[PDB]
Amino acid sequence: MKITAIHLYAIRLPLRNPFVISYGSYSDMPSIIVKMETDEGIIGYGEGVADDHVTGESWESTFHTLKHTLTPALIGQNPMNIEKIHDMMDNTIYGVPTAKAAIDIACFDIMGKKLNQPVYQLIGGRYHEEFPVTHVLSIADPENMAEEAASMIQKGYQSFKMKVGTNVKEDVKRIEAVRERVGNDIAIRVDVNQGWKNSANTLTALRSLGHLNIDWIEQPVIADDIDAMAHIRSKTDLPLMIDEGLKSSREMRQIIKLEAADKVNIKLMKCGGIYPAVKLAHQAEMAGIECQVGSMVESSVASSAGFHVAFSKKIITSVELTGPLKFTKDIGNLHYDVPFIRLNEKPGLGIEINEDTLQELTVFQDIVR
Amino acid sequence: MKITAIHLYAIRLPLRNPFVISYGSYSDMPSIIVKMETDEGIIGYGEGVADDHVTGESWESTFHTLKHTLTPALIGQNPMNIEKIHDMMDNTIYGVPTAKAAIDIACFDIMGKKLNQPVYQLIGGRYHEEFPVTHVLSIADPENMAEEAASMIQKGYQSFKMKVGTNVKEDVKRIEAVRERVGNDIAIRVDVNQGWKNSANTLTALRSLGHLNIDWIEQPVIADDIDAMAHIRSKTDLPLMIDEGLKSSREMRQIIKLEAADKVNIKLMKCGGIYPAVKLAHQAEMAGIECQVGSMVESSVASSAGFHVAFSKKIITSVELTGPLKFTKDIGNLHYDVPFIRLNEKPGLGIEINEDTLQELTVFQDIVR
Amino acid sequence: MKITAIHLYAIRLPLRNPFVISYGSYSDMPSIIVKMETDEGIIGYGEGVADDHVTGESWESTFHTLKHTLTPALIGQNPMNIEKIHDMMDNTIYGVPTAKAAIDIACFDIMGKKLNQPVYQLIGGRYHEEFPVTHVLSIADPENMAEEAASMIQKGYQSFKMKVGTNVKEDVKRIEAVRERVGNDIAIRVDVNQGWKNSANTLTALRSLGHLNIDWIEQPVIADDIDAMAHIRSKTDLPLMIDEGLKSSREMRQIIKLEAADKVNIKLMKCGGIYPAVKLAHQAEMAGIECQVGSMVESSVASSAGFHVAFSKKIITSVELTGPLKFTKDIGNLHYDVPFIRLNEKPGLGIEINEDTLQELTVFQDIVR
Amino acid sequence: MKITAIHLYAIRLPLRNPFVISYGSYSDMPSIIVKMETDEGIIGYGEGVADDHVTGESWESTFHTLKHTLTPALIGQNPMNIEKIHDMMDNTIYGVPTAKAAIDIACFDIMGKKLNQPVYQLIGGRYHEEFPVTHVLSIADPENMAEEAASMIQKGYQSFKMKVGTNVKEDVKRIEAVRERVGNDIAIRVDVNQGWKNSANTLTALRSLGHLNIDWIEQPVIADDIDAMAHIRSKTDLPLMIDEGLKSSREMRQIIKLEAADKVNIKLMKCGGIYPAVKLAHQAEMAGIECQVGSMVESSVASSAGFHVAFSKKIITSVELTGPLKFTKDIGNLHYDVPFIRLNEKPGLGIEINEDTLQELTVFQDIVR
Numbered sequence A, B, C, D: 001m002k003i004t005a006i007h008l009y010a011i012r013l014p015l016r017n018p019f020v021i022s023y024g025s026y027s028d029m030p031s032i033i034v035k036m037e038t039d040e041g042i043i044g045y046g047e048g049v050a051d052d053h054v055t056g057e058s059w060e061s062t063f064h065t066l067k068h069t070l071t072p073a074l075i076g077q078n079p080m081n082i083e084k085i086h087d088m089m090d091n092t093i094y095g096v097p098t099a100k101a102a103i104d105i106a107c108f109d110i111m112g113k114k115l116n117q118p119v120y121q122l123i124g125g126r127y128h129e130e131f132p133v134t135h136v137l138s139i140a141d142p143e144n145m146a147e148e149a150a151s152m153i154q155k156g157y158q159s160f161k162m163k164v165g166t167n168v169k170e171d172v173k174r175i176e177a178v179r180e181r182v183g184n185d186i187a188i189r190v191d192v193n194q195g196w197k198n199s200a201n202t203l204t205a206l207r208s209l210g211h212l213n214i215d216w217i218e219q220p221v222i223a224d225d226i227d228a229m230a231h232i233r234s235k236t237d238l239p240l241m242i243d244e245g246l247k248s249s250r251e252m253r254q255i256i257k258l259e260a261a262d263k264v265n266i267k268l269m270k271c272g273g274i275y276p277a278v279k280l281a282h283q284a285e286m287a288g289i290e291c292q293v294g295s296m297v298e299s300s301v302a303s304s305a306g307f308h309v310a311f312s313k314k315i316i317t318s319v320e321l322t323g324p325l326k327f328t329k330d331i332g333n334l335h336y337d338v339p340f341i342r343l344n345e346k347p348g349l350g351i352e353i354n355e356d357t358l359q360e361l362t363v364f365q366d367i368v369r
């Protein structure tokens, strides 16, 4: 089996509602789709949703890094030799996890189809039967956030993720409002997306959150400040999760060494795909750090890849991949059972790509042979 | 696919020559073979060679732990759900890595045969094309050790592993003798198997080894003393490898935290098989610790499993599985190309089991259904 | 004095009521009894109750490790040369503390009978006059646990050990229920048996236990995570006890180095018997760590051995050996004075073995000469 | 069994030759002998040789501490309840290890006689068969030291302990002279008795000792400076032993925590006797610290007690009790087999006290009832 050609599609996934977080607002999500072809006729799909603010990659830079830098050396290689492919990509260029993920995912999709097995079956097998789905509430006035929450509860949701990160006073008001609205049995986690900046502001905020039964506080300080996370952890009993501060094994090593967190948000776009995501899971397990597989809000393609990793590992206890539930159009057909997610047994990523939808969402494309 | 029955065979692999190390001498190697059957008719083989001195497991205790404790709960399970199977075994009993490895290996052999792929292809794919083979010199008079080395050089060997660990003075004499005999181009590594006990004796010995061009010193102190390894590492420039001191992720975490070694000897019998061996490799990689896949001197079955792990990972740079080259009888047919080892592309472990030889070496057996 | 033969008995001690803890439920307790004979006609009894989940030993594996690995080399040795016997067993096989304890206990019983002195008199003499007895409440609905507690109070008990470890919410409810029922003068300690897994869940739970006057929280996290215990200890003022996390001196060294606990639960089955239990006590004393001698729920034989250690050391301030109070049949006759335990002055373990009961509970046996 | 009376004898043991060390010179050794009587007629002997410079105890202060402070509360107690007796002495007065040792030794002598067993048989049993005896060379001109060494070699000695500690230049000259004289096969260890004061002077001295094959350097810096020992250990590969810096478990804890030494010199006079010496051995074993049982140069009584401890523990690898070989008169009859020491099987300390010699060496005495 050899890679014969790689199609690159620069698309834009339209959102039903604006997605608003501490460092940015989104009306749609630019994504790069990879269509990997092989001499045996097997086709694999991969995806890369770049978050400029997190990995230093953009929609346009990812397309070109894939076209000119990463894909050319891949023609002729066997998609199943994943360790080798990742080594080749790493020796070619440092970082660019999102671009690498796009390739990595397509390879696993092909491997699954070739062996007629779901991807999760190839990276450890089925461990989880299902995961609850958590609805993400975009930043807004405390009353609006509480209102959408009540509205989603009627839809079956029992777990919410509150986006905050503008001003401590306001963020606290937002969290208080939602909790009062949904009662105390509804699960709530808070994501600051680096909004509180440092330990001082964070600890001040945490003082007012002790009685709100918050499952965990996600990335309250700037990504690079692992020291601050450790300091905060030494002075609070609320569980702490690192997201932007964790990308590759480089940060995991530091998080483990400094005991900087209770949980980490692993994302295929931050580490380079399925294979490296799995390595991160194994590393976290060693230190007893609870893991979650989150996302940049992606199509059914990357979302599916994320679930396949999550379902195969005991250390991964929660998932956050709801892109297919937020977009008005999707190139894939990943099935959800809100308030739950369960994976079928279809080979590879277990999804079908609607090529008519793909072309429709395509702004520009190319092929590398 | 479901496990329908597990055959257990208590055998003894005869050695051509006595194997002599610091804490024991061996005339043959007791081993437990696992024959895993499935509803689909696929058969998988696993093996467990217990080293009492390292994991607290014996030939007889492993047979019974497998028969009464581990195998019963496995009937009905899918061999491909490896993460799940390992979780079930761990929730059933703590430790007993050798017994768990026997099961783990058979599952991968089945998975490989089922998907018609070599095991290495399922855990990362092919990375290495070959590995040089290192001949192990049993403890003996310096002149005898030097003599066997010269004799093996004529056989094509270019890398040797010296077993020492009786008395510092004598061990140094042994190492000096061999080096003088083989010249300075021949690779030599030294394994003390805990013989020097502590940092004081070790450092005294290292003073006399600086000019002998030794690749690395393996486990000079007692297994449990990780602190001593770190102390020694802080006062020497000779590479240090931990073997007995490393079993599972528990020790890896400590080795990483205390910066206790440059290299680690990963063995399927110490961690519970292929799956956990891979997790250890990923953990070592995070800390930039070079890995080796060694062995307890096993048949073609476990030896093959060890190579499949080694060939799939960039972090594993050397291998030490020569049981098939030391035994006068073997139940498997793993092919070697001394001074090198290369893996074929046959499915599963890629070996055929001679059942006539298996029965011939069997002392007692049983079946669990 | 020389060991002439060792009888091994694989028995099962029937429980009056099911014993239920976080990682398992028990209807009876499998045990291995050792009958050590000497050339002088003195007979000693030892016992090994294996907990698979804690030491990696099973009922069947212990019987065989004793039969094939440990006992053969003991024939001819003097039972009183305990340091030597332990060294011989350790050089023969690593770990297997339960199997080693079985031998160790029989040797002390013989030593006591030979010198016509209680065992405690041989390891430091009498220090304690008595110890209060704590009743262990198996996991159950908060109402059932509170009910049994009230019922046992009527029986004279004034100290209780609550077994929990399913779900933080539920565990807290269980603890609140019992405390409300028994009032605030009754002593209560909580054992999670690793149920809360990590520091995050543990600290969340501890928030709700501050006003319940709990003497100490025992092993809230997984055994191997000593780091987590230290972290928890740095953020709470409730006393912390390590149980499963402590087996031999290897863990004690780490517990002391990381200041991971206030108290430790020493058990003969985890360290290899009386002699090593004493060494652990001496080690704990150096660091000012309070000690307790607990148990796996054993017959009068091992239970007695445990008390003899406890009564001879000032650092051991509490005991947890109630197997004889839980079984419907016992091969020994250890006398209790609920709510207290006091040791008589009879030689050796100070108990008589009813051989008719022994044979009755025996499933299989053998003799090594 | 109860203590009915304690005789105290203030004696002086005459030396054949002056004993000269870094901080003092001795023509004879003042010692306090204890004769413990019991209601059962069993008599036990103990001894306390005080070194003012090490424990803050003198010949006269020890006699009176025993007479007025320690012995009165002991009348009526059972000598075999050693843990209790030590607790009573510790609650009565802090420190004074030498006075406490005198009592402790007599109790064990009685326990041994009562049970008709050697003391070593009561604290672990026989482990060692023999120990080589090391001759101690008092400080003197390099030529005189080398001369006595050659003279003692003719007497069968093969191991020497060089006393130095005046001036680095001179000490180095002394060590060079002896080594040149005896050749390189003779074992030599160096004891500075705090003479080099700090790490700077010590490290300067060590530069010139690297090629002299010295087994270890004993206490080069002032006793209280454990930090200095750790610093020196971090910059040298010569084994380091702490003597004066180690008295009780308080220092052991610190030595272990700071990794300040490779070996420690345990002495009954520094820790309070046999029982606490054993606890120190157990503590050292945990950290893998090699132990030696040294002495203040005592009569056959304390010397015997020291050997009984040494012979019962694997962690104790060398002994330094040669008082009986240095005195012209001794109240005891401990048998030596230079160049070796072996213990007989006589009960208790296994020695007979010549009361005529005792009275002859007595300057003043008293009895407490």
Ligand SMILES: N=C(N)NCCC[C@H](NC(=O)CCC(=O)O)C(=O)O
Binding pocket: A021, A029, A049, A050, A051, A052, A136, A191, A193, A243, A294, A295, A296, A297, A298, A320, A321, A322, A323
């Ligand atoms: N810049 C882009 N394109 N995306 C950023 C997403 C933020 C990310 N995901 C979320 O918050 C929702 C994940 C989900 O449910 O799919 C975070 O955890 O912070």
Ligand SMILES: N=C(N)NCCC[C@H](NC(=O)CCC(=O)O)C(=O)O
Binding pocket: B021, B029, B049, B050, B051, B052, B136, B191, B193, B243, B294, B295, B296, B297, B298, B320, B321, B322, B323
């Ligand atoms: N007790 C038993 N059965 N085996 C012990 C083997 C020792 C091990 N292997 C070796 O030295 C040789 C590995 C090889 O070449 O297969 C070690 O590295 O120390």
Ligand SMILES: N=C(N)NCCC[C@H](NC(=O)CCC(=O)O)C(=O)O
Binding pocket: C021, C029, C049, C050, C051, C052, C136, C191, C193, C243, C294, C295, C296, C297, C298, C320, C321, C322, C323
């Ligand atoms: N698996 C077996 N067979 N036993 C496990 C006992 C648990 C142990 N003992 C107890 O909880 C009661 C101790 C007593 O009272 O004897 C613990 O402390 O966790």
Ligand SMILES: N=C(N)NCCC[C@H](NC(=O)CCC(=O)O)C(=O)O
Binding pocket: D021, D029, D049, D050, D051, D052, D136, D191, D193, D243, D294, D295, D296, D297, D298, D320, D321, D322, D323
């Ligand atoms: N002040 C008095 N009374 N004695 C001091 C003896 C010094 C001690 N012993 C010795 O050097 C010789 C031990 C012997 O061989 O018994 C030391 O190790 O430094």
Ligand SMILES: [Mg+2]
Binding pocket: A191, A193, A218, A219, A243, A244, A265, A294
């Ligand atoms: Mg986030």
Ligand SMILES: [Mg+2]
Binding pocket: B191, B193, B218, B219, B243, B244, B265, B294
């Ligand atoms: Mg090795």
Ligand SMILES: [Mg+2]
Binding pocket: C191, C193, C218, C219, C243, C244, C265, C294
């Ligand atoms: Mg417990």
Ligand SMILES: [Mg+2]
Binding pocket: D191, D193, D218, D219, D243, D244, D265, D294
């Ligand atoms: Mg000294």
